[PDB]
Amino acid sequence: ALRNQQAMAANLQARQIVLQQSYPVIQQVETQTFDPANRSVFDVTPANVGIVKGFLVKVTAAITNNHATEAVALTDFGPANLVQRVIYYDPDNQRHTETSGWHLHFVNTAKQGAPFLSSMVTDSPIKYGDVMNVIDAPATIAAGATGELTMYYWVPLAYSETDLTGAVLANVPQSKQRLKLEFANNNTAFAAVGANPLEAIYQGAGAADCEFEEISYTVYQSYLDQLPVGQNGYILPLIDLSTLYNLENSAQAGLTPNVDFVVQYANLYRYLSTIAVFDNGGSFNAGTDINYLSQRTANFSDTRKLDPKTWAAQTRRRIATDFPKGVYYCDNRDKPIYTLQYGNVGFVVNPKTVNQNARLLMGYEYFTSRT
Amino acid sequence: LRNQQAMAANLQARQIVLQQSYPVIQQVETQTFDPANRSVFDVTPANVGIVKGFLVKVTAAITNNHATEAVALTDFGPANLVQRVIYYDPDNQRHTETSGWHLHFVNTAKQGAPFLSSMVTDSPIKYGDVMNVIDAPATIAAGATGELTMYYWVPLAYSETDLTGAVLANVPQSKQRLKLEFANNNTAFAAVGANPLEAIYQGAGAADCEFEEISYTVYQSYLDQLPVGQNGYILPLIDLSTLYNLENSAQAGLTPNVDFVVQYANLYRYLSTIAVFDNGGSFNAGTDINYLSQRTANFSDTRKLDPKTWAAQTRRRIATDFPKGVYYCDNRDKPIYTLQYGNVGFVVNPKTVNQNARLLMGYEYFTSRT
Amino acid sequence: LRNQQAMAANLQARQIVLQQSYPVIQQVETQTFDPANRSVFDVTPANVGIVKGFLVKVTAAITNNHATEAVALTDFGPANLVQRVIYYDPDNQRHTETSGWHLHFVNTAKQGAPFLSSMVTDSPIKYGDVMNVIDAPATIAAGATGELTMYYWVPLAYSETDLTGAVLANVPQSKQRLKLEFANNNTAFAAVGANPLEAIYQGAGAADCEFEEISYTVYQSYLDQLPVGQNGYILPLIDLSTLYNLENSAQAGLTPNVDFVVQYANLYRYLSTIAVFDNGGSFNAGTDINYLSQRTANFSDTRKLDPKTWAAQTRRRIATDFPKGVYYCDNRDKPIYTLQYGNVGFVVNPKTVNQNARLLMGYEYFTSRT
Amino acid sequence: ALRNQQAMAANLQARQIVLQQSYPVIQQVETQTFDPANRSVFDVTPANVGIVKGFLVKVTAAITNNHATEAVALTDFGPANLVQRVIYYDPDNQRHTETSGWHLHFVNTAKQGAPFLSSMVTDSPIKYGDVMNVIDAPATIAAGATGELTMYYWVPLAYSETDLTGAVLANVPQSKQRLKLEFANNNTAFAAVGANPLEAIYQGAGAADCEFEEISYTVYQSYLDQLPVGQNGYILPLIDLSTLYNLENSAQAGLTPNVDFVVQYANLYRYLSTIAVFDNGGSFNAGTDINYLSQRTANFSDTRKLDPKTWAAQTRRRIATDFPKGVYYCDNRDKPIYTLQYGNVGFVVNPKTVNQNARLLMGYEYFTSRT
């Protein structure tokens, strides 16, 4: 009965005590510089200490355009595509997040409430601004030039700094975690004119002759040390630590003009957010190829059937700007989509135009029970 | 004072409603028309659950048919696509009755930044003004047609978490009335030298500008699946018996270097005040004002400030300045509440006063249905 | 006969409502259009309180594009700016369904003088036709543009003090429908020799006349803040369950010196009758009629009168004569009520009958919703 | 509790008895002929007899235009401006009406339901018509000519012939009433071209050389004699006789284009009618300088927000014609404006055009308690 109500209360209290008694630490775990032509997949081994909240991954790169005459220009995702995929496994080898660099980046932005680690432009005469180039990439790389890029990703375990749901307790020696990073290479980073720019960093007539010179990464692990001890050992939020907070993405196809394309939510998960990217056969449009988007439950009842601009309006309230062309976001944080609470639910897109090889790339943020 | 009990209960009921019901935003009406034929519409909301507000989307195409002269956006621009709004609840009681520009400025004050705007940053990832949510061409050249988009949020409930002012509409069949008066060919275009206050574009080609058409879509935001208890629906009675309204007014009689005082009425709890100094058609960036203040009779000013310092307080609220001649005052944490008519007034001591000068006031307030 | 009790209660409730509620007249819709594109509109009234009626303001600009010929007002003139009106209440029941000219003549009969007219007097103080409330140029010369203004009152309630026929609209969300069909380029202008009955102007330049545009504004008159009692709303149940309607019809088959009888239906309590003798497009001042009367089968005529004496009775009601060929009959104090279809008829014995002659009838009546 | 309900009933009964038992009388009180160049203010002393209902004031005048060549023409108010102001004080020296001749005249018209004491034009062949020139003034007075004018004003104490609210009981010897009449003179009666015609009788290029030759007035007092006596002395409607029925006017400035100009009702009074004159800097327009007029209560809720022609339509139903240019009327007789019954109320004018020195001249008709 009220056995869980007491469980919930115990969890929250334990969380509050851990946060007040422990001290946060962020420390470098590993750094490596390489040429992706040699190797692009790396398995980083996080340190086993206290409760792990997440990882901040710094990525830098140098790209050279050796085309004789043509330039290349940033794609809509640009440096967010420096990391193609990220996968994390905890000490019990349970997989948490497994998604694309672009999806992880869009969630980082959604959680910040503004473009992740960006520098806002203001009229201040004091010289604040893009001083440190935290996330940066040249808009174009001309024939014969070399550009430098910097990108950051936050790989979460814990939901936030104050909500430890999804965090990982790593104090078991001989049982390691694994943070796998799959980086871009010359094949994924450069798209020829007319090719699909989805996974690319630069696109243009000089693409065939573009090459990475090097990529470097530094992984910083954020955790809580000096865990509080009481009468039974460590005071720990048991629900928080046995819940997985994950990001995952998938691709759905089968769109036809003026027909509702419905992507069912894969039940049992508590979906906090949904990102839908309309890759219209390599074309990414600013809503003009869509009639409306919606979230619908078993009853054909729509809770937010909106035209594209109005849908975008809701997103502007969340991140203070629009996501790139063809990228749509839906916040369900306060009331997560959870089938079994109200029948099957689906994310809906009714397309106005559908090109060949059209598809919806879905990105989800969700909570689910461990084991 | 059984009030503590009433408030305690109200707040608990509000939380149960927010926790148990489910939010819905739904289109209730769309229409396209030519301002030459009509510009006043009465939208009928759906009578379902607890209504929180209405999101009104307005799009328009404006053609500059002048032979050689262009026109440029006024300071309010697309915010003048809707001239006025009035809302009547199922009990025939009015809530908001104000201008489109005042409604828009409050939307901005409540968001803490220009309403539904896209902030500019150094991000290399292509975030930005991708969807043109609120948009209008800076100028429309002779012979050109410009496309505009504007959004307004007409609030009933104070916010997503504070249901004060919300309307219970699952109630009687009696209809709600959301009245909208749109800009027309007579209000949208101002000739050079004319007052641009209510206009969208001003310039030498104004006389030959016209609307090709205007379209609006109203979305209703409400809470459905209301929680039921012993006695029935669990409802925040104080929230639902309180009105959260925006209203505007105009005052004249300004004289150089003399305090011009606009009295606040009693009974109303004023959350914010906006004062626009329409200096005979000229809108200046504080240079025509000595100071502004809020004053209580026999207790002097609580914030007598020079225009720039007054603007500094506003920058802390919306992260920028409101347009020229528009002044904002936040009293949300401690609402102006006189108890005696005029115990408190809004003050403007003008430096220069042109012919036909006046202050256009805008208010946000709470008041009991009584 | 528990009727005495019902009527006694109804009347008491009516008085409480009039005493306790507050009258409101409010704009519900305005629109400007070109008759070349459309001329039929369905206005949606607000569903609030007890609705008494609608004041419809119509303005129009008419251009005579003829090269050299003018046109002049017909006898009905601006009263033909609205060709027809139909009202449906929230329960899908129709009330008034009649022509604009008949509606206007009833507006006049109820006022006791030409509707919204300005009476001429010797006063040296400058009262007079200052505001041109109902107005139209006597002629519009070739190449000229004339401006017209017309007002119509569409009644639901019988009067400001008698709520019989009024509509309770705070009720269901179900919408009211006020349908208006305006004059157009095909009905407003009559060529010389053509029937001017439904036209606004007639003359040699008619073929080249056209509307520059027409605009209308509908104002809704209702009672708000309805009084509540033990069982709830204190309401005059008889008043609200009775229909007060105006309706028109056409009858033909007239023959010189023979009684032409238009039977009244049963069930309806006819308050007034208007008969227009459209003598094949000619409208005469009684010279084509021997007499008019109202007759009951097997009880002869109750008022068989020569045309001038019939007109004399009308002069006592509206202080002047209705236009040529228009005849009025007041039966307000003792409404025509047959109980058997045709027990009573309206009679016209014509002196001269032209080709295509007919009587256009107009009625004001009360009838139960049954 | 129902102490007033019984008071109201007692009052009405007393009123009914007084009306049925007493006999109405109208008798001359005073007549005087003078040149306003000598004196223009007169304090008339009404006779103290029975219940006084009001005064009918007959005013005649002769005006000469001695300009060498130019004429003058009647202003919109014309002879209504023969009396500039009227003030009445009762035996206790309590002031009742205090207003302008033009406002008093407009109320006389509103109460009659047609231009006060006018002769209606009809097709009658019998010679009815303007036979007696009860209220009359030549449309123009040519250079070298003399015109004759006649004007009548009814100064009310009682509301009407059947409603004695506001009447005055004057049966106290040694305590007199005062009816002060302030007449026009050469300065107020003639306006030059371009000057404000508000208070003037004639305006034109010959104005500077116009002069009154004389003005004459005759005041008739209307009262009820032979007051009914019962068991307690005179049977008198106590509420009627302790209520003041007054007319007053004032000027309000501060108008600006397209902004609502609100004139608040000065609470506690029961306002029966309101007259608003838009003196637009000396220009009087037929509604073209106004967007709308209205009466609004604390709630920004308008009970009759109307465009000028529709507002005029309501007035045509009341007086069978329009008031002069720029004069607007509002009837609240059956439901008097009374703050404390429904919050503050205001009369509203939203001007389309505002000239220099624009202002609203407000005229009120109201009931208020004595003492």
XYZ file of C-alpha atoms in Angstrom, chain A residues 223-365:
143
model
C 30.837 12.996 -9.028
C 30.064 13.330 -5.324
C 32.754 12.399 -2.816
C 32.727 11.943 0.972
C 29.370 10.172 0.940
C 27.496 10.534 4.260
C 27.488 7.461 6.502
C 24.784 6.626 9.028
C 23.298 3.697 10.947
C 23.410 1.096 8.144
C 26.375 2.402 6.190
C 26.011 4.897 3.354
C 22.881 7.038 3.328
C 21.805 6.537 -0.295
C 18.705 7.397 -2.381
C 17.837 3.836 -3.425
C 15.205 4.784 -6.000
C 17.505 7.409 -7.579
C 20.383 4.916 -7.933
C 18.277 2.077 -9.359
C 16.609 4.224 -12.003
C 18.156 4.769 -15.432
C 18.029 8.226 -17.009
C 18.815 7.608 -20.689
C 18.875 9.228 -24.111
C 18.330 7.105 -27.239
C 17.423 7.777 -30.840
C 15.955 5.860 -33.772
C 14.800 6.400 -37.344
C 11.258 5.943 -38.635
C 10.155 5.905 -42.281
C 6.850 5.610 -44.138
C 5.678 9.205 -44.527
C 3.132 10.217 -47.162
C 1.609 13.675 -47.843
C -1.348 14.789 -45.719
C -1.435 11.550 -43.775
C -0.752 11.343 -40.041
C 2.608 9.687 -39.435
C 2.430 8.270 -35.917
C 5.452 7.148 -33.890
C 4.198 5.171 -30.903
C 5.919 5.648 -27.562
C 7.570 2.330 -26.614
C 5.670 1.928 -23.321
C 6.827 1.529 -19.726
C 9.440 4.297 -20.119
C 8.691 7.708 -18.618
C 9.477 9.997 -21.571
C 10.696 13.418 -20.420
C 11.312 14.882 -23.886
C 11.013 14.024 -27.549
C 12.974 15.409 -30.464
C 11.825 14.747 -34.019
C 14.086 15.604 -36.946
C 12.381 15.649 -40.323
C 15.152 14.522 -42.649
C 13.135 15.067 -45.810
C 15.404 13.126 -48.142
C 18.428 15.210 -47.229
C 16.443 18.429 -47.155
C 15.868 20.201 -43.840
C 13.078 22.752 -43.971
C 11.825 25.406 -41.568
C 8.365 23.895 -41.063
C 7.179 24.513 -44.624
C 6.960 20.768 -45.358
C 4.680 20.069 -42.376
C 0.940 20.667 -41.832
C 1.066 20.033 -38.071
C 2.706 18.077 -35.248
C 1.064 16.614 -32.166
C 1.093 14.175 -29.273
C -1.959 11.920 -29.319
C -3.316 9.285 -26.955
C -5.414 6.178 -27.535
C -8.659 8.034 -28.293
C -7.409 10.052 -31.274
C -7.480 12.895 -28.743
C -4.671 15.430 -29.354
C -3.197 17.296 -26.360
C -1.226 19.723 -28.535
C -2.000 19.544 -32.262
C -0.168 22.605 -33.580
C 0.852 24.211 -36.861
C 4.672 24.380 -37.154
C 5.112 28.025 -36.133
C 2.976 27.608 -33.028
C 4.852 24.429 -32.161
C 8.084 26.463 -32.578
C 6.605 29.159 -30.313
C 6.387 26.646 -27.453
C 10.009 25.713 -28.021
C 11.082 29.370 -28.026
C 9.684 29.537 -24.475
C 11.967 26.651 -23.535
C 15.327 27.491 -25.180
C 14.912 31.194 -26.054
C 15.379 30.513 -29.777
C 14.554 27.864 -32.431
C 16.336 24.536 -32.934
C 17.904 24.157 -36.443
C 15.775 23.625 -39.562
C 13.693 20.479 -39.394
C 14.371 19.859 -35.701
C 11.292 19.797 -33.461
C 11.243 19.558 -29.690
C 8.585 18.554 -27.168
C 8.925 19.042 -23.373
C 7.082 16.505 -21.149
C 9.281 16.936 -18.071
C 6.607 17.757 -15.498
C 4.205 15.085 -16.812
C 6.321 12.431 -18.624
C 4.623 10.414 -21.357
C 3.910 7.080 -19.684
C 1.686 4.501 -21.377
C -0.114 2.388 -18.758
C -1.135 5.720 -17.243
C -3.334 6.649 -20.211
C -3.259 4.147 -23.057
C -0.819 4.169 -25.948
C 0.499 7.594 -26.902
C 2.127 8.624 -30.129
C 4.141 11.511 -31.520
C 2.502 12.740 -34.712
C 3.699 14.518 -37.842
C 1.380 15.209 -40.777
C 3.708 16.159 -43.662
C 2.780 18.604 -46.416
C 5.602 17.436 -48.681
C 7.505 14.155 -48.720
C 10.677 13.690 -50.765
C 12.321 10.375 -51.615
C 14.075 8.736 -48.649
C 12.183 10.884 -46.141
C 12.292 9.827 -42.497
C 11.843 11.028 -38.926
C 14.825 10.719 -36.624
C 13.429 10.412 -33.107
C 15.376 11.319 -29.994
C 14.076 10.433 -26.534
C 15.013 11.384 -23.006
